[PDB]
C-alpha cells in the first residue's frame, strides 16, 4: 500500500472531517476508505479510520471563467489540483487528537481493514455478504440477523430495476454455505439455539423466475468471466469471497393441483399441497379468507361470531359449505368474496383421505420451501401466505427454538399497510415483536418504507436500500442516510447496493456477484 | 463529430455534477445530453454520461457595468464566457472519480446515446413513446407499463392549455402499431400472457373532436409540414418516430339511443348500448347510480338495503321500478335523484327482446373502442362508468388475463377524488391494485395531482407533465423534479412534455407529431 | 349568444341605476385621460362603445316598493306562494345557520315530508299551523 497523497491543512482538519490532496498515480475513488496515521508529541501513533464521501478537482492558476481553456490546451503552464474529503469512522486509540498536516495517508485492505468494519468485536461469527471495490470481502454480523442479539433483514428501494430479491437469495445462499451457523453452534453451553439446521421459505408472487433454484445456471459462467474482466479481478467473485459456486441443494416444490396440472411451468418433481376441510374449521382459520381491511360496518363481529359456531361444531363432529353457509344466513358481502375466493381455492380445499399431501413447512430435512402461488388472485394470494404463516408459528411456539427459520416475503408494503387492521396484519406484527426469542426470521421486501406500518420497520437492525427514488430520499424514515450519499443514491445502478447495520457508523457501497442459479425458462 | 467545447476547472468538478465550457461553435442548449471522454492514469477510459439543465453567458472585460456597455459596442476589449452545467446520469464504468478538467466533452447520438438512456438493460422490448429536438426516438420500458415488472401511466399537467389526452392517443397509437406486443409475445415459454390482443377503452367527456378516430386527418398534411421546414429536419416526423401515418384501425362507437338519433355530430357508424331491466336487477349493482358520495346521513345502509330486497326478489323471478318503490317505501332525497335520472337514463334501460344492445366489449375482434356520454349529464355520466369498469373487471377475471385491455379516464379527479368513499373510488382503487396481475391498465389524466387519492399516484410508474401551474411545483406530490426543472416547468409550450421513467434518474424532454387522426368537425 | 346576468347587492343603491345613463363622471373620465396621456377616449381605445346598459328589469319586495318608491321610476315586484313554496319540498333555506345543533337537520327532513304529504293531499298562518302540530322552540 503505496502513499496516495498528503493530508491538506488549508482547509480544517477537526478529527470528524479532514480534506486532504491525493498525489499524482494512485487515483481515489468515492466509498473508498483510507487511513491516516499520526505522531502524537509523546510518542504513541495514532490512526484514523475513515471512508471518503466527497472529492473534486481544481484548476489552480486561472482567475477568468471559462476564458482561458482554449488557452490551456494550446499554450499555457498550469496544474490541476486533486483533493478529496475526509469522513472518519472511529479513532485507533480513545483520544480526539486531529491529524497533523503533512501526514501520510493510505488505503489499507490487510488487518487494518478490520478495524475500519470493526471486525475485531466479531470474530467467531463472520459472515460475508458482499464485496467491496478491491479483492474486499465486507463482513457482516450474524448476531445482529439472528436472535443472539435481536434484529432483521429489511430490504428497500423501488422495485423492478432494483433486484432486491436476488440479493436477499444471496444472503441465504451465503448462510449456510459459509460456516456461520456452525461457528455459533461450537460452544453452545446449553444454549437455547444448538442446532446448524437453519432453513427458509421463499414465496413468489410473480412468475416462474424463481423456481430453478436446484438446476445450476450455465450462462452465468460466460457472462460473470466478461464483466469481472472488463472491471479488473484477481480471480472468480466466488472464490474470492469464499462461498462455492455450486447452487441450492435441491428443494421440493409446493403448487396447487389444478395450478401444478395447469402449468406444467416445470414438469419437474412438485409436491402440492391440500388443506383439508375438516381441519380448516378445526383449526379455525376463517378471517383470512378476507385480504381486505373490512373497517366498514363490524364484519369482523360477523366474522368472529361465525367462526365460533362454526369451530363448535367441528369440535363436536368447500363449496357446499358455501351453500351451507348461504343456507344459514354484511350477508352477501360476506357471500361475495367467498365466490371470489372460490374458484382458485375450491382445488385446495377437498374433502379426502390421503394426509401425507399437507403442505408441512419445517419437514425433518428442508433447507427452502418454495410455494408457487402465482395463479391464484390476490384475494387467494393473502389467504395462502396467511395460514401459513399461523402454521409455522404456532410449531415454532409450543416447542422451543432449537432452530432458525428464515421467512421471506416480496413486496411486504400492501401485506402490512398502516391502519389497515388486517388479520393478516396482526400475524406480522407478532413475528416482529416476538420474533428474537424464537428462531423465525424476517426478511422483507418494500418499495418506499413509508407505507409499511412503522413498528415492522422499527425493530429491524440491517436496512439495505437500491436505487432510491428522488420523491423518498427525503423522508423521515430514510435519516439514517447522511445527507452526502442522498445524491448518488440515484446513481446507484442494479448490482449494487447500500448496506446499513448498527455497529457500523455510516453506510458502505457493495455489489453482488451474479447468482448461480438460473431464473429465466 | 467535432466537440463542443471543454470541461471547465475553475469551479468544483465533482463527478455528481460538473461546469463545461463550449468553444466558439455549435450551440448547446438545455436537456440535451452529452458525453465525455476521461482517461486514467493507469489507462482504462472511462465515459460520463448526463443532461445539461443550466446554462449561461458571462461578459467578461469590463467591470463597471452599463458604464461600459455601450462602449463595447463601438471600441473595447472584451469577450463573452458561454458556459452550462452537467448532471451526469450513470458512469459507463462502476466508479465515482471527477473527470480531468481539460478533456473534451462531445455530444451522444449513435450507440453512446442508447447507453444514456439505458438502451441495453431494455433491448428487446424498447418501445418509442417520444422525440428528443433531433431525430432520436425515445425508448420506453414496455415492460413497466404492462404487468411484466407493474406499473402505470399518470398523465397531469394543467387543463386547457396542455394537451392532455392527446399524448394517451398517441401511446395507444404506438402500442397498437409499433409491433411492441408481438415481440414480447415471443419467446413465451408456456407464459401466462402470450397473446397480441391488445384492446383499448377510452370515454369522452368534452365535444365531439374524440369522436371521430376514424378518418384520417387532411389539415395535418399542411400543418406538420410547415413546422418541419420552419424548425428543420430531415424528413416527416412520423417517419423519424418510424411509424405509419394512418389512423386507427376497426373501432366501435357506442352511444345512446336517442342522443345517437338526434346527433346526426356523426351519422356513419354507430352502435347504440343499452342495459335491459331485469338483467341489471339481476346485476345488482345498483349503487352506482348515486353519483354523490353519500356522505349525508347513512344513505350507504338504506341503499344496500333497498338492493338487498330488490336482487331476492329480481333473481327468484326504467320509471316503472321507480313506480314500484314507492308502494314498498332521507328517502325522498333517494326518489328525488331517481326521479331526476329518469329523463336521463331512461334510454339506457328499456324492455325489449332485442339482445345484441348489450354494451358487450372486448369482443371476439375488435381494436378500440369509443363510448360518447357527452350527451348524458354529469350524475348519468358517472353510472355508465362505472358499470363498464366493473363489468370488464369481472370478466375479465372470471378468464384468465390471456390478453392486455388498457382503459383511459379523463378528469380524473372527480371520478376519484380523495375521501372520496363511493362505489366508484374503489373499482378504480381495486384496478390500481389489482391491475398488474390482470391484463387491465389505467391511463388516467388529472389537473392537479394533488386532489386525488394518493395512493393511485404512488401505484403510477410513467409520470407525465406538462405546462405545470406555478403554485403546483412547490408542492410535496412534485419531488422528483429537480430544482432547475421547477422555474421550466411553467415555460413549456403545448405540444411538448416531461417524460419521468424508473430507471432513468432525471426526467428528459419529448415533443409531438402532430395527430393524423381526424379531431375537427 | 343569449347570455344573461343575475346579478346581487347588499350595499347601498349605487347598483340601482344601471339603467339610466349619466354625464358627470363623463368630464372626469376626460379628466383622467389627459394627465395620464391617451389617444382617445379608454371606451373608444378599448373598442366597447359608451352606451350603458340595455334596458332590463329590476325587482324588489312589494313590502320595500311602497317604502323605498330610492327609484320610483318603475320596479317590478315579485310575489312567491305559500301553496307553490310548499310544492318546492324545499323548506330549509329559512334555518340560513349551520343548523349543527342537535338534530335540527333530521327535524327538517321530518316535517318537510310529512308538509309535502299534506300539500299532495289538496307565513303567520303557516307558523301557527306548524305551531300547533306540537330544539322546537328555538326552530319557531
Known sequence: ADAIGMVLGTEDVTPTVFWFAVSHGASVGLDDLVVVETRKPDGTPVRFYGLVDNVRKRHEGVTFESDVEDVVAGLLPASVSYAARVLVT???????????????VR????????????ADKMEEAAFPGGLLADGQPLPLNFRFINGESGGHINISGISGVATKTSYALFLLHSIFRSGVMDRTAQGSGGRQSGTAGGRALIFNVK?????FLDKPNARMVEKEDKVVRAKGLSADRYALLGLPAEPFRDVQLLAPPRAGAAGTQRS??????VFTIREFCARRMLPYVFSDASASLNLG?????????????????????????????????LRGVQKYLSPLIRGDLTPEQAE????????????LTVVDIHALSAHAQMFVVGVLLREV?????????????????????KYAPREGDSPIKDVLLDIAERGRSLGIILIGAQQTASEVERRIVSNAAIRVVGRLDLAEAERPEYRFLPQSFRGRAGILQPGTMLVSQPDVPNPVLVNYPFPAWATRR
Open 393 to 413: 408459528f404456532e410449531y415454532k411456539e409450543r416447542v422451543g427454538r432449537q432452530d432458525t427459520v428464515f421467512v421471506v416475503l416480496d413486496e411486504l408494503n
Open 107 to 118: 488505503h489499507a485492505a490487510g488487518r487494518e481493514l478490520a478495524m475500519a468494519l470493526s
Open 268 to 273: 419437474e418433481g412438485v409436491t402440492p399441497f
Open 207 to 211: 412468475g416462474e423466475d424463481l423456481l
Open 301 to 333: 363481529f360477523v366474522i368472529g361470531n361465525i367462526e365460533e359456531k362454526l369451530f363448535r361444531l367441528a369440535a363436536a363432529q368447500i363449496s357446499y359449505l358455501e351453500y351451507k353457509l348461504l343456507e344459514e344466513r354484511f350477508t352477501r358481502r
Open 90 to 104: 472511529r479513532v485507533d486509540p480513545e483520544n480526539f487528537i486531529p491529524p497533523q498536516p503533512g501526514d501520510h
Open 356 to 367: 401425507g399431501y399437507r403442505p408441512d413447512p419445517l419437514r425433518r430435512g428442508i433447507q
